[PDB]
Amino acid sequence: DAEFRHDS
Amino acid sequence: NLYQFKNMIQCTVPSRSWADFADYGCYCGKGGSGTPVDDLDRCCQTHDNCYNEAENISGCRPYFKTYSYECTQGTLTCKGDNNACAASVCDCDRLAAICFAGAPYNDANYNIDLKARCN
Ligand SMILES: [Ca+2]
């Protein structure tokens, strides 16, 4: 999927 | 942790890709400044502040801390076996996921210019 930073 | 938070969003908002929430308004995702742009951004502002508070606990890292939770049959629950750090972070994530499910999603507010608009 990802390692995008967050979903805050 | 963030993997668990992502699964919380998938359970409460199964219409849409968690990535939709990863870069929204001034608070959802990387951002943490300025005036929240709408109701969804306000969910994220509260979540961001919630994590800052949990960070005051010794050795508590909300981005990485694995907690115990369940999401079945429309119900999200943080479990009883959580320590103080796990319990606080789980509740920050749970309240955000519930908040996300009730607020309207404005496509215009996705991927906005943080440097220009979030002062
Ligand atoms: Ca944020």
End-to-end distance of chain A, in Å? 17 Å
Which class best fits the helix and strand makeup of chain A? little secondary structure
Helix fraction of chain A by DSSP (H/I, runs of at least 4): under 10%
Number of strands of chain B: 2
Instruction: Assign the CATH topology of chain B.
Output: Phospholipase A2
The total of helices of chain B stands at 4
Q: Rough shape of chain A?
A: elongated
**Strand coverage percent of chain B:** 5-15%
Helix coverage percent of chain B: 40-55%
**Which oligomeric state applies?**
heterodimer
Largest sheet of chain A: none
Largest chain interface and its two residue counts? Answer: A-B, 7 and 19 residues
Q: Radius of gyration of chain B over alpha carbons?
A: 14 Å
Q: How would you classify the helix and strand content of chain B by structural class?
A: mainly alpha
Shape of chain B: globular
Residue fraction in strands of chain A: under 5%
The number of distinct structural domains of chain B comes to 1
CATH class of chain B: Mainly Alpha
Output the number of helix runs of chain A: 0
The CATH architecture of chain B would be Up-down Bundle
Main location (chain B): secreted
Pfam family, one (chain B): Phospholip_A2_1
Disulfide bonds (chain B): 11-71, 26-118, 28-44, 43-99, 50-92, 60-85, 78-90
Cofactor (chain B): Ca(2+)
Explain this structure to me?
The complex is a heterodimer of chains A (8) and B (119). In chain A, 0% of the residues lie in helices and 0% in strands. The radius of gyration of chain A is 6 Å and the shape is elongated. Chain B is mostly helical. Chain B has a two-stranded antiparallel sheet with strand order 1-2. The interface between A and B is medium-sized, with 7 and 19 residues. Bound molecules: calcium ion. Calcium ion (CA) binds next to helix 2 of chain B. The site of calcium ion has 6 residues of chain B, from helix 2.
